[model samples]
Target: MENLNMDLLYMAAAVMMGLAAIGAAIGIGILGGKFLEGAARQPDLIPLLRTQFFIVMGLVDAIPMIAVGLGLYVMFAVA
Candidate 1:
């Protein structure tokens, strides 16, 4: 049915958004902990390490960012 398809799309978009948020949050949490460990271990390298830490986190977070964007598009535009 048409209504069924619409409902499914809405649910899919919601699930995608939820999963993306959770995945990104969990990933960033792990990454932050590791960065802290490294920074604590090497105070001298904190300056250089901070850049790499954010760079890596940005890369790791990119996927979820894309997912969130597409999910929004689907929910708002397509659906």
Candidate 2:
């Protein structure tokens, strides 16, 4: 029935989005750790390091955003 299909579709979307979030969390966590490590050693480079970190952080988040968009499409368009 349509109900069964809809339920499964919802579950698929949930999995997609959930994994995306997990991946983003892990990536950002590591990024933060490395940033701290670098800053600790070269305190004077904090400004440049911070700038690079900000750019890389945005890059790291881009994948999760794409996954979220795909999940939304699956929920609204495919389903």
Candidate 3:
């Protein structure tokens, strides 16, 4: 078997990380801002707001986590 040059895999990992970070950053930025605004508008819903925040945060981070896991797999598992 030929020894494969894996520089392309490294580049792919870099791109995956960059795109995931950008997307997550944008999503969390908007999510946090909206959560704050919601809590401010309905101060009585503070507990609900916190719960909703965690749910939304998890949803927003799901993609990034998947992306990171893929990148790590490409970097280490493929090696």
TM-scores of the models, in the order given: 0.53, 0.53, 0.53
- The residue pairs in collision within model 1 are none
Top-lDDT candidate index: 2
Ranking by lDDT: 2, 1, 3
Backbone N/Cα/C clashes per model: 0, 0, 0
- Candidate 1: tens digits of C-alpha lDDT, residues 1-79: 5666677766666676566666666666776656666677567465456746654664565566566657655665554
lDDT of 2 by residue, 1-79 (tens): 5667777766666676666656666666676666666667676465556847744674566566567757665665555
lDDT of 1 at 40: 70
lDDT of 1 at 22: 64
Please list the Cα RMSD from the true structure of every candidate, rounded to 1 decimal place. Answer: 3.7, 3.9, 4.1
Off by over 4 Å in 1: 44-79
| Best of the two (1, 2) by lDDT | 2
